[PDB]
Amino acid sequence: LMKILTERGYSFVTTAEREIVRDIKEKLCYVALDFENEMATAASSSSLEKSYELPDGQVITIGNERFRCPETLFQPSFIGMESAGIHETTYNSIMKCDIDIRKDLYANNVMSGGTTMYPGIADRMQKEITALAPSTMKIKIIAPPERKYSVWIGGSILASLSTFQQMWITKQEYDEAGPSIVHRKCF
Amino acid sequence: ASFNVPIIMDNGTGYSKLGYAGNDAPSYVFPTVIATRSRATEDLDFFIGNDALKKASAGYSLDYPIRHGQIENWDHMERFWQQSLFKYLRCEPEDHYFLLTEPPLNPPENRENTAEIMFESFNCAGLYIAVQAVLALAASWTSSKVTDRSLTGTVVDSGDGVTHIIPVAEGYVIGSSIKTMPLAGR
Ligand SMILES: Nc1ncnc2c1ncn2[C@@H]1O[C@H](COP(=O)(O)OP(=O)(O)O)[C@@H](O)[C@H]1O
Ligand SMILES: [Mg+2]
Structure with a gap:
């Protein structure tokens, strides 16, 4: 997204601007159901683009960049990956x-x-x-709808199970076994 | 008639010292730890002592059956006893007398389990349980020929898992004065 915002004109370089562009993608991006037709209809730029208020005050206006940067998930060749x-x-x-x-x-x-x-x-x-x-x-x-914290939800569910207390790595066991006990037990 | 020599077991928290009566030294002094997995069945793939220590990263997970002097898991203890008897000590249980030892202040349930394991899994001719101390008072006197036994003193038995301060007066052990600190070499 940082790379493809340059072609629009706006330049983001440092880490703070990286967090800013992450905030932009947080709420101004989506995955198109179809790609070729969406890019074709982006030519009549009416309902695709919408402005975003940059922290400074100047407003950004991104069009096809909204759905192009999440398309890389389905087409990894965009960032040069075979x-x-x-x-x-x-x-x-x-x-x-x-x-x-x-x-x-x-x-x-x-x-x-x-x-x-x-x-x-x-x-x-x-x-x-x-x-x-x-x-x-x-x-x-x-x-x-809550799949954002799904891993933590599963971890909390698993932690409060009676069979689980036998699957811990007790401090004494680690002290007597070294750091390879995690490979021995966890997985 | 002429019985076989009694066998002196010893199951400490850190080290187990097997041997025989009349010997001048224990036959085996090896750590009280058993290796275990988690085409030999998983019933028998267990190693104890120095063999378990060397075979630690080859696919086994060590575990100490005894902690603080009291046995928690019983599979490990029974497997330890059978491996010892039939591998290192090399004795037939039905034709010998055993002298087990275990720290005082243990629950009676532990003694009951030890007795039933010994007389059912192995069923030896006889089993005697003594208190870790006592034997200490017996071994205190060196030139024990006929008479020079102190028979009255205090034994400060500090070991790997738990330490015991036990007074003895004219042989008998005064129970009301027994006190134990739960700190030791470990
Ligand atoms: N030379 C030593 N100095 C101090 N502590 C020792 C020494 N040798 C062994 N120890 C520790 O003291 C413990 C007591 O030995 P032992 O009586 O065989 O153990 P246990 O109390 O389990 O029967 C050992 O297991 C070890 O942790
Ligand atoms: Mg001891």
């Missing part, structure tokens, strides 16, 4: 599994992380996975 997008790596990971559990994995896609809070990412991901996968079974994507 890697498949998230929509394709999910299908690849599913195909890496056994032939029986794939049907259950298709209908249970748990979105997580703070990056996945883009308004309109679940729909695009579901469409892409449906296109990739065979057309018979249904593809269901799960986007809880």
Whole structure:
């Protein structure tokens, strides 16, 4: 996003400007359901762009930059990476599994992380996975409204379980075992 | 008739000292720790003592059955005893007498479990339980020929897990004066 704001004219360089542009992406970005048609209709720039108030006071006006910078997730070649997008790596990971559990994995896609809070990412991901996968079974994507803190919610749920107290790494055990006890026990 | 030599067990918090009666030194003085996993079944892939110590990063996780002198986990203790008896001590349980020792102030439940394990899992001819101290008073006197036994004193037994200050007067141990500090070499 910092790189593509330069072509618009506005220059952000230092770390403070990096935080500023992160704040910009926080609330002025989304994932388009379709990419080519959205870029085509961005030519008639009517309902796409909308201004943002920079901390200084001058106003920013970003058009196709709103949905171009989150598109890099599905097209990693934008930043120069020979890697498949998230929509394709999910299908690849599913195909890496056994032939029986794939049907259950298709209908249970748990979105997580703070990056996945883009308004309109679940729909695009579901469409892409449906296109990739065979057309018979249904593809269901799960986007809880609180998925921003999903990892912490799961950690708190796991911590208050009776079986869990036996899975800790007690201080005495670490003292007698060295730092490799975490590899011994945790995973 | 002529019985076999009694066997002197010892299960300390840090070190276990096996041996025989009449010997001038314990046959084995090795740490009270057992290695355990988590085509031999997982029932038998366990090592104890120095073998367990050397085989620490090869795929085993060490664990100390005894802490503060009282045994918490029982699988480790019973496996430790069977490994000792049938691997290092090399004795048949049914034709020997054992002299187990364990620190005072232990729950009666621990003694009951020890007795039932010894007389069911192994079922030796006989089992005797003595207090870690006492033996200390017995070994105090060096030139113990016929008479020169002190038989009256105080034994300050400080070890790895717990220390005990036990007074003895004319052989009998005065219970009301027994006090124990829960700090030791560990
Ligand atoms: N030379 C020493 N000086 C001080 N402490 C020692 C020395 N040797 C061993 N220790 C510690 O004192 C403990 C007492 O030894 P021992 O009586 O065999 O143990 P336990 O109390 O478990 O039966 C040892 O386990 C060790 O931690
Ligand atoms: Mg001791």
